[PDB]
Design a protein around this motif. Structure first.
Motif, PDB file in Angstrom:
ATOM      1  N   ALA A   1       0.810  -1.223   0.000  1.00  8.78           N
ATOM      2  CA  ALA A   1       0.000   0.000   0.000  1.00  8.78           C
ATOM      3  C   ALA A   1       0.838   1.266   0.000  1.00  8.78           C
ATOM      4  O   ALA A   1       0.444   2.287   0.552  1.00  8.78           O
ATOM      5  CB  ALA A   1      -0.970  -0.003   1.166  1.00  8.78           C
ATOM      6  N   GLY A   2       1.967   1.230  -0.702  1.00 13.59           N
ATOM      7  CA  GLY A   2       2.704   2.478  -0.945  1.00 13.59           C
ATOM      8  C   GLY A   2       3.916   2.210  -1.836  1.00 13.59           C
ATOM      9  O   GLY A   2       4.262   1.053  -2.050  1.00 13.59           O
ATOM     10  N   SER A   3       4.495   3.281  -2.350  1.00 12.36           N
ATOM     11  CA  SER A   3       5.751   3.186  -3.083  1.00 12.36           C
ATOM     12  C   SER A   3       6.859   2.725  -2.143  1.00 12.36           C
ATOM     13  O   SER A   3       6.866   3.102  -0.980  1.00 12.36           O
ATOM     14  CB  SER A   3       6.076   4.512  -3.673  1.00 12.36           C
ATOM     15  OG  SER A   3       6.464   5.460  -2.677  1.00 12.36           O
TER      16      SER A   3
ATOM     17  N   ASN B   1       6.267   4.100   2.268  1.00  7.93           N
ATOM     18  CA  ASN B   1       5.843   3.145   3.283  1.00  7.93           C
ATOM     19  C   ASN B   1       5.813   1.712   2.750  1.00  7.93           C
ATOM     20  O   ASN B   1       5.287   0.817   3.416  1.00  7.93           O
ATOM     21  CB  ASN B   1       4.433   3.533   3.770  1.00  7.93           C
ATOM     22  CG  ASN B   1       3.443   3.586   2.625  1.00  7.93           C
ATOM     23  OD1 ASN B   1       3.613   4.345   1.647  1.00  7.93           O
ATOM     24  ND2 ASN B   1       2.439   2.739   2.685  1.00  7.93           N
ATOM     25  N   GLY B   2       6.309   1.520   1.510  1.00  9.12           N
ATOM     26  CA  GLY B   2       6.123   0.278   0.793  1.00  9.12           C
ATOM     27  C   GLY B   2       7.349  -0.641   0.717  1.00  9.12           C
ATOM     28  O   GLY B   2       7.305  -1.601  -0.065  1.00  9.12           O
ATOM     29  N   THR B   3       8.408  -0.337   1.471  1.00 10.39           N
ATOM     30  CA  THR B   3       9.552  -1.209   1.574  1.00 10.39           C
ATOM     31  C   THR B   3       9.391  -2.205   2.712  1.00 10.39           C
ATOM     32  O   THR B   3       9.099  -1.850   3.859  1.00 10.39           O
ATOM     33  CB  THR B   3      10.885  -0.475   1.688  1.00 10.39           C
ATOM     34  OG1 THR B   3      11.130   0.270   0.495  1.00 10.39           O
ATOM     35  CG2 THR B   3      12.051  -1.416   1.927  1.00 10.39           C
ATOM     36  N   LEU B   4       9.682  -3.458   2.388  1.00 12.47           N
ATOM     37  CA  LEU B   4       9.811  -4.538   3.356  1.00 12.47           C
ATOM     38  C   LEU B   4      11.246  -5.015   3.415  1.00 12.47           C
ATOM     39  O   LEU B   4      12.019  -4.946   2.450  1.00 12.47           O
ATOM     40  CB  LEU B   4       8.954  -5.740   2.962  1.00 12.47           C
ATOM     41  CG  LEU B   4       7.439  -5.530   2.951  1.00 12.47           C
ATOM     42  CD1 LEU B   4       6.744  -6.786   2.419  1.00 12.47           C
ATOM     43  CD2 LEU B   4       6.975  -5.104   4.354  1.00 12.47           C
ATOM     44  N   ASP B   5      11.580  -5.597   4.559  1.00 17.24           N
ATOM     45  CA  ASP B   5      12.840  -6.314   4.683  1.00 17.24           C
ATOM     46  C   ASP B   5      13.059  -7.313   3.559  1.00 17.24           C
ATOM     47  O   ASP B   5      14.193  -7.392   3.067  1.00 17.24           O
ATOM     48  CB  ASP B   5      12.954  -6.927   6.076  1.00 17.24           C
ATOM     49  CG  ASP B   5      11.896  -7.927   6.500  1.00 17.24           C
ATOM     50  OD1 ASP B   5      10.931  -8.131   5.771  1.00 17.24           O
ATOM     51  OD2 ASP B   5      12.077  -8.535   7.612  1.00 17.24           O
ATOM     52  N   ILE B   6      12.008  -8.052   3.148  1.00 17.92           N
ATOM     53  CA  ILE B   6      12.141  -9.004   2.049  1.00 17.92           C
ATOM     54  C   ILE B   6      12.400  -8.324   0.700  1.00 17.92           C
ATOM     55  O   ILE B   6      13.052  -8.980  -0.117  1.00 17.92           O
ATOM     56  CB  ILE B   6      10.978 -10.016   2.000  1.00 17.92           C
ATOM     57  CG1 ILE B   6       9.605  -9.374   1.905  1.00 17.92           C
ATOM     58  CG2 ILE B   6      11.041 -10.937   3.219  1.00 17.92           C
ATOM     59  CD1 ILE B   6       8.553 -10.332   1.567  1.00 17.92           C
TER      60      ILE B   6
ATOM     61  N   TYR C   1      13.746   7.489   3.883  1.00 23.54           N
ATOM     62  CA  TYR C   1      13.137   6.840   2.721  1.00 23.54           C
ATOM     63  C   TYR C   1      13.446   5.338   2.776  1.00 23.54           C
ATOM     64  O   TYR C   1      14.358   4.887   3.459  1.00 23.54           O
ATOM     65  CB  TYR C   1      13.625   7.484   1.416  1.00 23.54           C
ATOM     66  CG  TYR C   1      13.202   8.913   1.212  1.00 23.54           C
ATOM     67  CD1 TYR C   1      11.882   9.234   0.896  1.00 23.54           C
ATOM     68  CD2 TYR C   1      14.118   9.944   1.218  1.00 23.54           C
ATOM     69  CE1 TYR C   1      11.476  10.546   0.734  1.00 23.54           C
ATOM     70  CE2 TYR C   1      13.724  11.261   1.061  1.00 23.54           C
ATOM     71  CZ  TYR C   1      12.408  11.567   0.820  1.00 23.54           C
ATOM     72  OH  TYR C   1      12.075  12.882   0.636  1.00 23.54           O
ATOM     73  N   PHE C   2      12.621   4.529   2.083  1.00 21.43           N
ATOM     74  CA  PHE C   2      12.821   3.089   1.952  1.00 21.43           C
ATOM     75  C   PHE C   2      12.965   2.410   3.321  1.00 21.43           C
ATOM     76  O   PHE C   2      13.674   1.441   3.490  1.00 21.43           O
ATOM     77  CB  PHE C   2      14.007   2.777   1.014  1.00 21.43           C
ATOM     78  CG  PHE C   2      13.821   3.270  -0.408  1.00 21.43           C
ATOM     79  CD1 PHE C   2      13.290   2.434  -1.401  1.00 21.43           C
ATOM     80  CD2 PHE C   2      14.245   4.539  -0.799  1.00 21.43           C
ATOM     81  CE1 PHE C   2      13.140   2.846  -2.725  1.00 21.43           C
ATOM     82  CE2 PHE C   2      14.088   4.939  -2.126  1.00 21.43           C
ATOM     83  CZ  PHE C   2      13.521   4.112  -3.068  1.00 21.43           C
ATOM     84  N   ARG C   3      12.261   2.954   4.337  1.00 19.69           N
ATOM     85  CA  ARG C   3      12.328   2.377   5.656  1.00 19.69           C
ATOM     86  C   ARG C   3      11.893   0.907   5.618  1.00 19.69           C
ATOM     87  O   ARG C   3      10.827   0.572   5.094  1.00 19.69           O
ATOM     88  CB  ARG C   3      11.434   3.165   6.623  1.00 19.69           C
ATOM     89  CG  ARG C   3      11.990   4.525   7.029  1.00 19.69           C
ATOM     90  CD  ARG C   3      11.084   5.405   7.883  1.00 19.69           C
ATOM     91  NE  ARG C   3      10.108   6.183   7.138  1.00 19.69           N
ATOM     92  CZ  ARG C   3       9.284   7.112   7.623  1.00 19.69           C
ATOM     93  NH1 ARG C   3       9.201   7.362   8.925  1.00 19.69           N
ATOM     94  NH2 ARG C   3       8.614   7.857   6.772  1.00 19.69           N
TER      95      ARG C   3
ATOM     96  N   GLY D   1       1.283   6.854   7.266  1.00 17.87           N
ATOM     97  CA  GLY D   1       1.846   7.105   5.944  1.00 17.87           C
ATOM     98  C   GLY D   1       1.353   6.147   4.855  1.00 17.87           C
ATOM     99  O   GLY D   1       2.029   6.016   3.816  1.00 17.87           O
ATOM    100  N   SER D   2       0.206   5.491   5.046  1.00 23.28           N
ATOM    101  CA  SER D   2      -0.208   4.436   4.148  1.00 23.28           C
ATOM    102  C   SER D   2      -1.253   4.908   3.137  1.00 23.28           C
ATOM    103  O   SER D   2      -1.901   5.955   3.317  1.00 23.28           O
ATOM    104  CB  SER D   2      -0.735   3.294   4.957  1.00 23.28           C
ATOM    105  OG  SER D   2      -1.016   2.178   4.179  1.00 23.28           O
TER     106      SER D   2
END
Ligand SMILES: Cc1ncc(COP(=O)(O)O)c(CN[C@@H](CO)C(=O)O)c1O
Ligand SMILES: Cc1ncc(COP(=O)(O)O)c(CN[C@@H](CO)C(=O)O)c1O
Lengths: 394, 394
Positions: A78-80, A84-89, B26-28, B49-50
């Motif tokens: 649900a984001g770029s 807010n759209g980065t995951l560890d994976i 960014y890219f958290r 932020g979603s």
């Protein structure tokens, strides 16, 4: 309001004509997993129209990885990536791809298409140049049109044309050459040795699109640069996850400063939601399998070599492929449509290539192999393809 | 080769400076489901932020639908919709979206971004015009640049500017106006009544991008045309699946002849692999939930109304939002970065908007509500936001 819009679309008749003639075979609704056989309208159809070169979309390990990521991470981010759209994976998959293709860094995109839009739109700007093989994938052309640079096409695998065109350009400008690795229509491979030799002479950046190369050529499938030993002469290696890697998305890998620039400046990553967790996990698990289990690539090539030999032996006219894509010339649009539909109706799925994408006289069907095809399946399809080509009088 | 390429990226310093100052946010990397709280670096962080406005990425029904589609259909379709990449479930979702937004037909794209590229690149051509609100989403600008038309921007929600610009154009040309429905930066709604009145006067096609409207405004969330009662004056309704619908992908809906033209002529659907089965199934199941369970939209708006009131009551300066996007002005890039990071470090996730996307003096943070937020969470975030704004001296 629709007056003028109706006029814009009014001349597009080919689909209605195909449908009315009973020839239409686009958007065929599959009811099952993408596999060596698919179900369409309740019937079984041999699939020789896929990009899943290693057959991995049905691999239970990959399915389970995706299902486990859904359990842990949900259905979407649900984001770029940027916000807010980065995951560890995602970061894990970037690291793993970087290692696989031998580069410092990588950035994921939610499609292969957007993976080309990213670097082509934002690296070369005003007063710079992008040089494109004329047969480059549509996404490359489009990405380049999103730049503020001058886009120049050169003749397909024509190194003299590339060199000449580069030679005419101002010294005080940046240049970037982008090419497909394996070109999907005819299945041929870029002349990367000469291309990179020229690039080095003119200090041009090199980007290769390995959509159809990953999992196909190179050491343990690592792509075109890998196939040629030219990792050090290719600035950017782009790939997709929608083919061998059995998923959705893509990436660009390269030097960390360049990748850092991309991930903060490419509109197709800053302004588009990130890959779903399921697709990150299926790509991760497929990438493991491709490396750890050499049989997939081996069997893909056994099938390719067998099918190609069997087609040539039956007198089909093939394009200059060097890949699991076997283009079979028909050289008549009408016949290409007829053959495609007659094969469909007899349980064989192939992909037509017709005007206006190519000239009538170069119209063809594309027969693609997967690792999971059996020789018996190939034989059945070829048997049917002989019968249909006769019925159609090719 | 990298000399000139290195010079192209050499001036991009802002990320290294942010990182060196300890401000980079960014890219958290999130370690958990997208939810009202997320885990980052092992700690819990309130998520404001979603884009998941209805909180549905964690809905077990939607997760299970996606997992069941993986079981049945595998991890990917491995081709464009046009060829081997259509499933029965894609067609089902098209039919269901068409019904939801009140149009004849729809075509899916594998991202929202590509959903805009499709119609904007291929409907208006040479000697035609596309008219864009100047604040339209980047994907709209990009899609329009992929057309062979002349692209004209008009002043943000400036109907006189739109009318004037349309008036100057040759009668014997097609025109298409494309606008965001809800504009995400400030959260405002297009003046669709006047826009469509003008379109009708000049026989211009109308396309609305409802990324941030679906699941938010309109009857049972059906979007901006629905919100205004103007279904009959909007030719194309575009949406995305990456926000309320908790997934990945998008669509364009409209008249069947127009949609038929699109699905055969838009490069972003002909030359890009189809949505994964998991994402088709999660979108289908979310769309059911949004309609069948009115509480989601209701609670989203209760939260929005509460948070907005609470922010105004504490003396924050808000943008002219009409949506769950609450833009909070800071008006200094340095402060915007500082506030963003200080909030992160105190367990609150907001999104910065800074130069060069906006002028320094209009820099802000965007605080977005989800249906699943509690009033207690809102209160905690606002408490923290008051403390940080003081520490930063805004
Ligand atoms: C109005 C509008 N139209 C289209 C898109 C593209 O949709 P996608 O993010 O699903 O690709 C977005 C994306 N908006 C988000 C990412 O999802 C962004 O950070 O820009 C949008 O806001
Ligand atoms: C060389 C190359 N580069 C990029 C892409 C885009 O990748 P995507 O399909 O994962 O978006 C493709 C897509 N190729 C397929 C769809 O997957 C097509 O039908 O065109 C490709 O062949």
């Amino acid at each position: 309001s629709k007056g003028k819009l109706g006029e814009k679309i009014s001349q597009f008749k080919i689909v209605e004509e195909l449908k009315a003639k009973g020839l239409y075979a686009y958007f065929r609704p599959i009811q099952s997993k993408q596999d060596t056989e698919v179900k369409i309208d309740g019937r079984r159809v041999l699939m020789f129209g896929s990009n899943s070169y290693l057959g991995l979309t049905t691999d239970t390990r990959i399915i389970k990885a995706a299902q486990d990521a859904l359990e842990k991470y949900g259905t979407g981010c649900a984001g770029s990536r940027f916000l807010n759209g980065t995951l560890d994976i995602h970061v894990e998959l970037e690291e793993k791809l970087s290692a696989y293709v031998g580069k410092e860094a990588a950035i994921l995109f939610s499609t292969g298409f957007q993976s080309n839009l990213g670097p082509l739109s934002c690296l070369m700007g005003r007063n710079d140049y992008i040089l494109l093989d004329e047969r480059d994938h549509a996404s490359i052309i489009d990405g380049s049109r999103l730049s503020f640079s001058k886009v120049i096409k050169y003749g397909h695998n024509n190194m003299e044309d590339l060199r000449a065109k580069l030679s005419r350009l101002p010294e005080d400008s940046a240049k970037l050459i982008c090419t497909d690795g394996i070109f999907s229509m005819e299945g041929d491979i870029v002349n990367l040795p000469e291309l990179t030799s020229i690039a080095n002479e003119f200090d041009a950046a090199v980007m290769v699109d390995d959509a159809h190369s990953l999992g196909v050529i190179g050491h343990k499938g690592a792509g075109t640069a890998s196939h040629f030993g030219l990792n050090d002469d290719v600035d950017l290696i782009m790939g997709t996850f929608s083919k061998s890697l059995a998923s959705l998305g893509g990436f660009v890998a390269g030097d960390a400063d360049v990748i850092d620039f991309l991930k903060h400046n490419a509109r197709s990553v800053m302004f588009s939601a990130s890959m779903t967790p399921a697709s990150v996990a299926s790509t991760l698990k497929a990438l493991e399998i491709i490396q750890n289990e050499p049989e997939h690539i081996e069997k893909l090539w056994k099938n390719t070599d067998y099918a190609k030999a069997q087609l040539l032996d039956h007198g089909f006219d093939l394009g200059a492929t060097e890949s699991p894509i076997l283009p079979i010339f028909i050289r008549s649009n009408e016949k290409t449509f007829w053959v495609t539909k007659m094969l469909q109706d007899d349980g064989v799925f192939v992909n037509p290539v017709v005007s206006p994408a190519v000239p009538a006289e170069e119209s063809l069907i594309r027969f693609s192999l997967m690792a999971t095809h059996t020789y018996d399946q190939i034989d059945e399809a070829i048997e049917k393809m002989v019968k249909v080509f006769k019925q159609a009088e090719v």
